[PDB]
């Protein structure tokens, strides 16, 4: 086997059956998190969407812009039948797990012959003269056909669009300026023009009530948290955690840092969490992760024996504690010899007087003293030839 | 060799498998990912080879110097051609290397003895020419540095440097002279 | 005159799956399509660490004996009180060794991304003990202890011998002993003072290693063209069927950073190995005996040398 | 080295009896987790049936393996299926 | 210098030709391939 015993680990790592005396390496120890603290502010509001095929929208030239704040979301659920639902930059089916930031639902109506014209990096008259999407967009495009209302018996004449515009359109900017556009020279076409909505023609002639639901994540202290209730609060364990959508893993202790009330978190040198503000207790905490350690295995040589003493490198703890770390399975003695199996910080294990594994401070050799005098000398009398 | 079978994120690890199970217009991506991975693995291998070759070059130049200063002559560099005093050397061949046989002189057995810098004969301070003064308790003797070969302090075993006073530790002993016995 | 030589860098270590990936599984799986890579990396770093241990073991272990200073300090007037260890010190390091140790001088965060550090095999007390043994052997036996068994000899006579090996007849030393002792003592005073207020060769090593490790740590903060530099964030925001490509780009970047770091570490390890080989040869030729190579044991005609420990 | 299903060495496995000669008869419905190992000490080919599936209630396609008719059907079993020859 | 005429899987070995024929939001991929290979060339050089 590869992992039942340290001997199995050594044999599987070295791909051999007779392991020689020394120290060898295996995987590293990981402290698993015992539980997970769930934290979220108590947000009671539910965002309005039945009003956002309710009765009537605006057209695309002057498109309805709306704000969302301090309410909860739910995508499983007052609503409209949906032909399409698509979320860029984020999983549409994982949304309720987050605490969003600055949620904006962009509402208008548009013909069914130009459903595909709206996307981050599209071109053509619609997406250049009426609406415009940034190329680093993050949000959802929600579309559904609306022929129940906006295609009259004699045709619809309530919605307009711009044909050709001298200037382009900024991302997220509205065009509400109507003027006779100078196609050529000889200063003065009218922009706003009725569409062809009649239920008498193919589905593309129908309007599609489309709401562009853009949003941000974890940019500012966020309060658009999803339907997940918080849990209780435990400290001083290797735990998981989450805060306003953020996830993580570590040990949550007390804090000593002062903050300003327009920030959320604290980042260290490597750009990762250092301190956190709770969303309910509104207090400050410190993060010290629990994933640490190095594993080392000592053997006297499989030829001799099979009892092995495992070493743990950066772990506070026959369980002997050393500067080299947590050593388990070794009889610490005061008697010092030459090094047999080097450990670190002047420790060496050996298989000596059944017999077992002993850890000790090494010796530097035999200690003697030279009988120095200012009137004595030692003169050799013999030789040895050493090859 | 093992690096070939890994996928490097591509769906399969054989170009024939890719080209068969997939259309080239949609398999160029798999081909390119595999090519990039194999190139970078080869780059790592070549860099390892370069560094190993540099280390081996250092060892080879050390071996050449050891040969030229241990085999082709004796060397005074303490502990460079053995452990002890060096006499001579013997090279041997070896698979991907060389093996040396250093023949090192080593002294083993030593006595005591009580010593002093100089000898005060007649107000003249006698210092050893190339030897060292020892005392056998009863007399003084001049011997060579590495062997107890005691000899009589004569005037050719010493040289004078003026008066006895300046030197510290100078002992008062006679210095034998050959000439006076021969005069008659 | 003094000479300053690095002998070993700090023993570093890294674990890939803890560095590139981390508290994640799909990252570990996507990396598993390379795993011989990270086995190579950990093998190379382990080789470098054990090489540093062997390197110090080679430079400082020349004596198969441990030599102690005789309690009588009658060395013909030479004041070695500065360089011999002082028992009254809390530690077993002599005055000039301590004054050196003082002139040369975050860790947790680095420990928290796999960059664990290993300790040296020999403790500074053990190293100072070796240097003290070498000093006592040199002072009490001349150079024979490097080529046999230690033989007693008066220090004045040994100095006269070392004069005899440059062309100056013994009577010169035996007549100017007091003057020579005074010059020696004044020189030791001057050197301790001149170091009491540099050591660039021992600090550039530490600074370079710290800068390389810091650069690795900084690397985790870049996107490498992904949507976010946080695997946990991308996992909680995005689904497995599409996040895999961005994850893979992140592995590619971080793996490249590790590869570059390992290559530069190997090169610097080779450089330090060359420097430590030079130091070992200087030890065996200058301390364990007089050398007649010009400008290899000082500046001028050479008489003898004393080694002192230092940080790295 | 391989990466597959294996029995960990020294596994705490279960031992079943059928000794009547005392009045022991139970071969319970064992769930099939990934991989099952079977070491049998017999004298008279005692084991006779091997049924595998999920519900086996004539409401899904079920497997019928015996010692060699192997029928995938939708079988309606009874409370305790066993077999038997007469003497 | 001769590792400038390489394509690295991209269509144009000149950034001018990439930009003057292709839109920024569909040209990052071409830039990405080019930049990766040019950085790799620098890495090989500095190591040597
Ligand atoms: C939410 O409820 C918790 C528990 O009652 C309370 O501690 C917290 O102050 C409340 N408000 C906030 C800020 O979420
Ligand atoms: C509104 O909600 C009800 C049930 O909750 C559902 O039957 C209906 O389809 C939704 N209405 C619209 C117009 O989408
Ligand atoms: C080691 O193995 C050899 C055989 O290869 C054997 O003769 C010797 O006794 C063994 N020593 C032990 C038990 O370590
Ligand atoms: C942890 O370290 C302290 C250091 O003083 C020690 O006393 C203690 O025994 C160690 N063990 C644990 C896990 O408490
Ligand atoms: C010696 O070993 C023992 C354990 O056997 C330990 O308790 C003690 O602290 C060690 N040190 C000395 C010198 O007593
Ligand atoms: C010196 O040692 C050698 C060892 O081979 C021995 O043969 C010889 O007799 C010894 N000589 C003396 C002077 O004791
Ligand atoms: C000889 O005796 C003297 C005086 O006791 C002593 O200093 C010297 O070390 C002895 N030499 C040896 C090695 O026997
Ligand atoms: C000289 O010294 C040696 C060793 O002590 C001794 O055996 C020998 O008898 C001495 N000879 C004289 C002349 O005293
Ligand atoms: C050694 O020093 C002592 C005390 O100063 C002195 O009595 C003795 O004569 C000196 N011996 C020699 C030979 O240097
Ligand atoms: C040698 O003789 C001189 C003059 O009498 C005297 O000063 C000196 O102390 C004597 N030295 C010894 C070692 O007897
Ligand atoms: C050496 O010099 C120091 C400097 O103060 C002095 O303290 C000490 O006594 C001197 N040692 C000897 C042996 O003269
Ligand atoms: C598992 O193994 C132990 C071995 O001591 C045994 O006592 C126990 O009965 C076994 N059964 C279980 C609980 O799986």
Residue numbers in the entry:
A (entry chain C): 290 to 341, 343 to 367, 370 to 480, 489 to 617, 641 to 676, 689 to 722
B (entry chain C): 963 to 1146
C (entry chain A): 723 to 827, 849 to 940, 944 to 1058
D (entry chain C): 50 to 70, 76 to 121, 126 to 145
E (entry chain B): 963 to 1010
The authors write:
Here, we constructed wild-type (WT) SARS-CoV-2 pseudovirus and its mutant bearing the A372T mutation to restore the N370 glycosylation. The A372T mutant pseudovirus displayed about a 50-fold decrease in viral entry into HeLa cells expressing human ACE2 (hACE2) compared to WT. The SARS-CoV-2 S protein bearing A372T mutation displayed a 5-fold decrease in ACE2 binding compared to WT (262 nM vs 51 nM), whereas the same mutation had nearly no effect on the binding of RBD to ACE2, suggesting that A372T mutation had more impact on ACE2 binding in the context of trimeric S protein than RBD. After introducing the A372T mutation, the percentage of the closed S trimers was increased to 84% (348,420 particles), and the percentage of the open S trimers was reduced to 14% (55,181 particles). Two atomic models of the SARS-CoV-2 S A372T trimers were built with one in the closed state at 3.1 Å resolution and the other one in the open state at 3.9 Å resolution. In the closed S trimer, all three RBDs are in the “down” conformation, and the open trimer has one RBD in the “up” conformation. Structural alignment of the S monomers containing “down” RBD from two different S trimers revealed the root mean square deviation (r.m.s.d.) of 2.50 Å for all aligned Cα atoms. The S2 subunit is more structurally conserved with an r.m.s.d. of 0.48 Å than the S1 subunit with an r.m.s.d. of 3.86 Å. When the S1 subunits containing “down” RBD from two different S trimers were superimposed, the NTD, RBD and SD1 in the closed S trimer all moved inward to the three-fold axis compared to the open S trimer, and the shift distances of the NTD, RBD and SD1 are around 9 Å, 4 Å and 3 Å, respectively. In the open trimer, NAG370 does not contact the RBD in the “up” conformation.
